[PDB]
Amino acid sequence: LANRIADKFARAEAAAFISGDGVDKPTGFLTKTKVANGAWAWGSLGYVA
Amino acid sequence: GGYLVDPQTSETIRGVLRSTASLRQIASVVNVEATSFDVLVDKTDMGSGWASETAALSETATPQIDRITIPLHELAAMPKASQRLLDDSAFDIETWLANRIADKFARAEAAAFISGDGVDKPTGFLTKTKVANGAWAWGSLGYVATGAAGDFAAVNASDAVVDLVYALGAEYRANASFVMNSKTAGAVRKMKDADGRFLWAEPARLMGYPVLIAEDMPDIAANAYAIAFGDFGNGYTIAERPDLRVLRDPFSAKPHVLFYASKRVGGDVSDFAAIKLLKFAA
Amino acid sequence: GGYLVDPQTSETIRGVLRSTASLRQIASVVNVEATSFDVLVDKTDMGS
Amino acid sequence: TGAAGDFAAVNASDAVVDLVYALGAEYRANASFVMNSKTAGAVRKMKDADGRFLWAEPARLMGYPVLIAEDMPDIAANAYAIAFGDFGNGYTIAERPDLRVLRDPFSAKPHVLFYASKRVGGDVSDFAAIKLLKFAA
Amino acid sequence: GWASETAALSETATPQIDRITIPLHELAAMPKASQRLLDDSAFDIETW
Amino acid sequence: ALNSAVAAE
Amino acid sequence: MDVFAKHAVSLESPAVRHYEITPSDSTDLARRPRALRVQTGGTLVLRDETGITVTYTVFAGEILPVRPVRVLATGTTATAVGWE
Amino acid sequence: MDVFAKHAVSLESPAVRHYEITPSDSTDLARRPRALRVQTGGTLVLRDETGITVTYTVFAGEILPVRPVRVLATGTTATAVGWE
Amino acid sequence: MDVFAKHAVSLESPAVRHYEITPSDSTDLARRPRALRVQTGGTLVLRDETGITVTYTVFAGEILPVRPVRVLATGTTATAVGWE
Amino acid sequence: MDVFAKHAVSLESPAVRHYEITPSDSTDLARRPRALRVQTGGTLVLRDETGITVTYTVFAGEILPVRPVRVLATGTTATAVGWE
Amino acid sequence: MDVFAKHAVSLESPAVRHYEITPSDSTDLARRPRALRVQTGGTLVLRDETGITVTYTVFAGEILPVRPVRVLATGTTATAVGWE
Amino acid sequence: IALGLGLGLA
């Protein structure tokens, strides 16, 4: 169980590192108010289409 | 004068060198001094909480556990050799038959590791109640279908290879391999683009993934499973004894020697999520 | 005489092997014994 | 191959790949092509519908090493210009590895007349390990 | 065989053996060199 | 590996 | 027995699969064709994936190498068969 | 003496091999052609490998870049020659 | 549902996008087409990117595989639709 | 001055070299052409490399993308020019 | 705005650059064209780079995918425009 | 344009 709980923790933190929101878990980079690149400011991530 | 010429023979009695690609080198080999082997896998996973500061914490999930029973059958051969030969045939016939029996067993267990059934031989991955991928339950191997019945797909050929690759799981593709036979590998290398150039680029790997050329998978029939792909090192468990038990009997066949040799070996699939197949149906 | 057969179990209990590509091996992993961490970045530059 | 003189026109280089994959799995682990130079030139001249030659210092073909001999027949009507296989298992050379020289100042009298010889032999040992390409039909 | 539990295993096949005779012929050449050349031709013509 | 009487065996 | 079985089917390649089309009018086609073989001459209207449509005054047996998403039934007087 | 002997024969390439076809009707063709050169104008019916068939009101000397599996004899009034 | 969705659209490939052109006369086209399907026969004038122009006495339903930058309105009597 | 000088000449490429053909009848052509431009309409007979021959009822100015080895003179009423 | 700007212009690709040709007669063309769009039907004579020439009885609006070095003026009755 | 059999644009 000490190996399998660690496995599930390393797999469940990957969802928070990517698509996680702010509540009680890390906020992933997909949830960071994306603003289109070219109109790029600091407080936002850029995308191209 | 020509009776003085005494032709020199070879050092070691040679033979035709047949295929040794036996799936044993890519799977999980386990030494076993028993009659059956029992692998214990997990078919589910746990749950994580992301627990808050001061709310609660309930019971979380615990992975349910499957026992898979390797039957560990035996494989026996008994050549009858002559006592006049063994004393007068200066090549060491005892260890030559012990090498050839070991070669025959390593070749005959390759057919049982792939398409053997349950009766006194291991069950290969092909005889494991295949279910189309997408509706994948645990007790089954998944396949994807190409399209047209005989050959690959018509308008878009060779993506059957790609979606079979990318429907196998991300961790299993880290060390995975294709398994084919030679007249399927020839047909895959014959596949070519709209201009006449074969579209694919000593292990003879495909798309970067290694390729095991068996000789015991089916060829490309109407509904055959000619190409398999996956992490056989986690998916397939071979349980065996790492020796070749030889007993010589000068007693039943009385002027003969009658080497009874038998190693014993078993195995089926241990992880159903780690092998996918290519069906040619629809 | 088939009850004396006692099948040998595995050495280690195995498991289904799920994905571990977790973005932890490419990002900046920092050990921290506190309630929070404060990365201090520079959002502009100087002039010459 | 197909057509009598050349390779098979509609689909070409398939006579190569079924020759490779009609040789066995173990022998292809260390096998080699055997050709001559004007056959290897005719192979390298093969190109797709774009004019680009499709076969991408030992001058290997399809990953497999190639021995450019000079004593095979060229691409004739019913010739066997390309061989392929594990000749290390398939073909056996038996010889004396020394070159016996006897100089003779006695027969040809103002001359020295070096009589040199070595003895050598060999045919196929393993018939399963050599495959040929016939250009007939 | 894939021998059963109680099957009374009879004989099996045993590979028949072929001898192929390498004949070991000989290959001979006899060049004719001048004794005036060998004495006056400072390159080592014998080993050449 | 059989009798020495038959040549091919 | 096709000698071109291993060859991939590009857009430039000949018609492997053919199916007759109906002027469906605001229901898209099942599969969009690489080309249209016209059966009976007339006019027919064709819509792209970007949505713009024009009328084509087509002749009787012409193939036209256009790749339409939907054939509408408003101005369609011409029957065609799709090639793919 | 062809200077294009080493070139591969694609589907887009010209007709290397030609053979006249008969309206066989529930026996498939020997080799399926890349294209059909029509000899006499009329109607002819063509079946794919997927099985669906349509009638083609074809003209006299047209080539039609379709790749049929079987030409049936029910509605076939037009004689053609296959190209491959 | 296109089976050729992953395929790249080359210049040789069939017409994905079509738009009717107007004889703009010293204002260039929005997108230059791979080919021009003519709607009504007549004459039309076409300019390259290098600037040289000729008159084309075109027929009714012909496709002409030219890639023009601007269609002028001086000698244009023929209506066409661009393919791209 | 050709800007396409470095480009390779495939089978799909346009006609670089042209030569008029005579209905030779059991003497093969000097070079087999990629295509045949017909000059005068009629019938002409064409033989493959595999030997089978058919009659083509060809029209006046058609190009036919066939690659013949020999044009016989028995049924040939039509004059053509080879393209290669 | 061309979406095919990055694409290379092959021999099989559509006509990027067009220029009207004159029957120059023993002065070679400035640039040899990939194809010839004929303006007025008639006869025109074409020479390869190897030097052999034939007369083409061409029709009115045909494109002919030939790549000529020089168009002579002896038998040329037909006006054409080159494509490249 | 050129000499293929291909249902295509050019």
Residue numbers in the entry:
A (entry chain T4): 194 to 242
B (entry chain S4): 98 to 298, 305 to 385
C (entry chain T4): 98 to 145
D (entry chain W4): 243 to 298, 305 to 385
E (entry chain W4): 146 to 193
F (entry chain P4): 89 to 97
G (entry chain B3), H (entry chain A3), I (entry chain C3), J (entry chain E3), K (entry chain D3): 1 to 84
L (entry chain F3): 2 to 11
From the paper:
The structure of the native RcGTA head with imposed fivefold symmetry has been determined to a resolution of 3.6 Å. Unlike the phage heads that are isometric or prolate, the capsid of RcGTA is oblate with the shortened dimension along the tail axis. The organization of the RcGTA capsid is derived from a T = 3 quasi-icosahedral lattice; however, it lacks five hexamers of major capsid proteins in its central part, which results in a shortening of the head. The volume for packaging DNA in the oblate head is 35% smaller than that of the corresponding T = 3 icosahedral head. The formation of the oblate head of RcGTA requires conformational adjustments of quasi-hexamers of major capsid proteins positioned on the twofold axes of the oblate head relative to the quasi-hexamers positioned on the threefold axes of the T = 3 quasi-icosahedral capsid. By contrast, the quasi-hexamers on twofold axes of the oblate capsid are bent to enable seamless closure of the oblate head. The quasi-hexamers on twofold axes of the oblate head contain subunits in three conformations: two subunits binding to pentamers from different directions, and one binding to a hexamer of capsid proteins. The surface of the RcGTA head is decorated with eleven 70-Å long head spikes attached to pentamers of major capsid proteins. Each head spike is composed of a pentamer of base proteins Rcc01079, and a single subunit of head fiber protein Rcc01080. Base proteins attach to the capsid by the N-termini, each of which binds to axial domains of two adjacent major capsid proteins within a pentamer.
Gene transfer agents (GTAs) are DNA-containing phage-like particles produced by some species of bacteria and archaea. The genes encoding proteins that form Rhodobacter capsulatus GTA particles (RcGTA) are derived from phage DNA, which has been integrated into the bacterial genome. Here, we use cryo-electron microscopy (cryo-EM) to determine the structures of RcGTA before and after DNA ejection, and to visualize the interactions of RcGTA with R. capsulatus cells. Particles of RcGTA have heads with a diameter of 38-nm and 49-nm long tails.
